[PDB]
Chain A
């Protein structure tokens, strides 16, 4: 009965990941005054499945200069960590209930940067090495602020358990007492997931395709499934943390439906953002995060350390 419960997590997520590729191509379409896919199936609904099938019948590439062990490991790691980020998410009851879920999300997210690094390095190509060394630069940019932002929000929550955020937001979104951190949190998630205007590791304009330039076929498909799963998860995580869905102990179906509506809406804003802005320069990404966000995040960390103290609003341990 637990195996059936994995099915009803990993399969709906994978289906939802695929259609995000369709929603991306049609929202980008209509925002660009065109229609996006709409021939492959009714309104393109079969277009995601065509792309998947075609990619797994495409010849896979084994470049002569490549380090095969890491070349193969990297896409496999990418998609594993994308699916593993989901098992602790409470919706409103998580598949795996962890006391330090927030750290499991932080630690799993960091380890997924090594799929970019190892793949790029293992390709033994100049454009793939440029892409990898932007993954290093991008992580050094957003890592420090992203952890501290979480610390600030969790001092109103009382613990690193994700399931306790449901109870913190019983009467109010954390977005209100924390909208400065949500603004900084949201931009971090665009950097965490290599999403425009921060698609610097890929960055088709400057690097031909960045880290995955030497990847074709099914191995390259796994990288994308990982990229789009993370988009849903990071916005799903942002919905739990800051936009707490309605939770009634008698209507757990209500929390999921409301959780989905806000997660879909936030996922759309990622697609909305990609259609609206030019791409950052990856040196300027560091300056954004270290010279703007970091000074503000440290101050808000000190604000939220003191805030429960001088209002006697310390969250409970349990």
Chain B
């Protein structure tokens, strides 16, 4: 089914009643006064602004923000250097090296995310089989140099410890949708 947006030529006859209405529309700028009215109504509406940085825009528990490396409740790293986050990363943003640890564990000696290649797609979060790499809820981490946005393993583990209290609750609020 289709409809006409700008068809109306079912021509009627110009009555003296109607001609005087067209003229008042043209001479008295009536439709232009209606537009002035609409912006006047908006003047007395409450503005939609929020008082940043004291007020924040809403976010959901799925929000894809800054990265972080998580641990187990015992303090052991979850990452086992499987390299699946590396194989999926659309941007080739993750670099990993691994070797047997001193106790024989499978662990990474290197883990980098070049946060200037990252597209924040969250695919690494999906690929990880042990919830080691996540995108936390932080979004306010702009720097003053490019080099500060190349995260090595220490930086990412530090973000994990910094944000764990909040990361753990977001996974708790969302893992059942995954």
Contacts and interface: CB of A to CB of B under 8 A. Distances in A.
A108 interface: no
Nearest to A38: B49
Interface stretch (A29-37, A125-133, A141-149, A213-221): A29-37
Contact of A29 (B32, B36, B40, B47): B47
Nearest to A187: B29
Task: Bin the interface of chain A by size.
Answer: 10 to 19
Contacts of A35: 47, 49
B49 A34 contact: yes
Contacts of B40: 31, 272
Contacts of A275: 39
Interface in B22-77: 32, 35-36, 38-40, 42-43, 45, 47-49
A10 to B, nearest CB: 32
B42 A34 contact: no
A317 interface: no
Contacts of A272: 36, 39-40
Nearest to B28: A183
Interface in A3-28: 27
A273 B33 CA distance: 10
Given A272-B36, A277-B32, A277-B35, A34 B43 contact: no
A31 B47 contact: no
Nearest to B33: A276
Contact of A31 (B32, B42, B48, B49): B42
Contact of A33 (B35, B36, B48): B48
A178 to B, nearest CB: 15
Interface of A: 27, 29-35, 272-273, 275-277
30 contacts: A27-B43, A29-B47, A30-B42, A30-B43, A30-B45, A30-B47, A31-B39, A31-B40, A31-B42, A31-B43, A32-B42, A33-B42, A33-B45, A33-B47, A33-B48, A34-B47, A34-B48, A34-B49, A35-B47, A35-B49, A272-B36, A272-B39, A272-B40, A273-B36, A275-B39, A276-B36, A276-B38, A276-B39, A277-B32, A277-B35
Given A30-B45, A277-B35, 15 more contacts: A27-B43, A29-B47, A31-B39, A31-B43, A32-B42, A33-B45, A34-B47, A34-B48, A35-B49, A272-B36, A273-B36, A275-B39, A276-B35, A276-B36, A276-B38
